[PDB]
Amino acid sequence: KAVVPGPAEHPLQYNYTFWYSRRTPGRPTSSQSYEQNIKQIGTFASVEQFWRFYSHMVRPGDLTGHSDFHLFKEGIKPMWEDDANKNGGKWIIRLRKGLASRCWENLILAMLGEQFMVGEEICGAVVSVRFQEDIISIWNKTASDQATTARIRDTLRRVLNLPPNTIMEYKTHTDSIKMPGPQRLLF
Amino acid sequence: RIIYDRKFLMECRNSP
Ligand SMILES: CN1CN([C@@H]2O[C@H](COP(=O)(O)OP(=O)(O)OP(=O)(O)O)[C@@H](O)[C@H]2O)c2nc(N)[nH]c(=O)c21
């Protein structure tokens, strides 16, 4: 079962797993329910194995519904509850429609190619497709590590071509957990 | 650490 690079393939620093989820906004969501709505697509160990999945995948810009792709180090679930994520957080970038597919490709290539240079800190990346915008996120292990979170922010600026006036926001997962005019109906 | 630049990664797209 264990995934290894093939004979002539180019090995990665880590194995990674693609995940996919589709839901609706505003669901009363426990740990167990969240985990049931996310599914593993495939795991890879080499650059060539990456492209075998990625070249055959729907681009996030072409997904319908309230849907997400997650690409995380093998053994890390894309959930706050995972031991690797419990003390962590994420940089988020919000994008108008039409930009997510290119941004996602740049993000995951930078991640896989070890462009962040924060040791073991990266957990994974998410692209979230929503009603009138898309969101791209990168998760790391230790939210309190200011050197790490700053290095990640700067790397995103370096590898992504963002519209002028693009806000980046850092959210600790513990802040996310405890976060609450009209109710938000379409997202 | 195993590091790859973007260009190298893209170049691998056309090999199995
Ligand atoms: C990553 N998430 C997200 N999540 C909760 O599950 C619900 C659906 O997640 P989502 O589709 O990413 O949220 P979304 O509607 O895009 O917006 P927001 O993140 O602003 O709440 C949200 O209420 C979210 O807070 C989670 N709940 C648990 N238990 N564990 C988790 O890791 C996560």
CA-angle at A147, arms to A144 and A152, nearest 5°: 95
- Half-sphere CA count of A24, side-chain side, radius 13 A: 6
Question: A2 in a domain, yes or no?
Answer: no
A152's enclosing H/E stretch is helix A146-159
Question: A187 in a domain, yes or no?
Answer: no
* Dihedral of alpha carbons A85, A81, A45, A55, sign: negative
The protein residue with its alpha carbon nearest to ligand 1, atom 19, reads A176
CA-angle at A69, arms to A165 and A137, nearest 5°: 35
Question: A4 in a domain, yes or no?
Answer: no
Ligand 1 atom with minimal separation from the A79 CA? 32
Q: State how far the Cα of A8 lies from the Cα of A168, in Å rounded to an integer.
A: 39
Residue linked to tokens 């079962």:
A1
Residue linked to tokens 């969240």:
A34
Model resolution, angstroms: 1.7
Q: State how far the Cα of A72 lies from the Cα of A78, in Å rounded to an integer.
A: 7
The method recorded for this entry reads: X-ray
B16: chain A residues, CB-CB within 8 Å: 48, 52
Other beta carbons within 10 angstroms of residue A171's beta carbon come to: 15
Q: State how far the Cα of A144 lies from the Cα of B15, in Å rounded to an integer.
A: 41
Residue linked to tokens 């240079």:
A117
Question: A96 in a domain, yes or no?
Answer: yes
Cross-strand partners of A20: A39, A69
Question: A148 in a domain, yes or no?
Answer: yes
Give the SS3 label for residue A10. coil
Question: A57 in a domain, yes or no?
Answer: yes
Which residues, at least 6 apart from A120, have a Cβ–Cβ distance to it below 8 Å?
Answer: A141
Q: Tell me, using a 6 A CB cutoff, whether residue A187 lines ligand 1.
A: yes
Report the domain count for chain A.
1
CB within 8 Å: B9 and A109: yes
Question: A3 in a domain, yes or no?
Answer: no
Give A78's DSSP letter: S
- Half-sphere CA count of A44, side-chain side, radius 13 A: 19
Question: A13 in a domain, yes or no?
Answer: yes
Residue linked to tokens 């700067």:
A154
Q: What is the CATH number of the domain that holds A139?
A: 3.30.760.10
Which residues, at least 6 apart from A144, have a Cβ–Cβ distance to it below 8 Å?
Answer: A87
Range of the domain at A96: 9-181
Using alpha carbons, select from A8, A91, A4, A78 the residue that is nearest to residue A41.
A78
Which residues, at least 6 apart from A99, have a Cβ–Cβ distance to it below 8 Å?
Answer: A134, A163
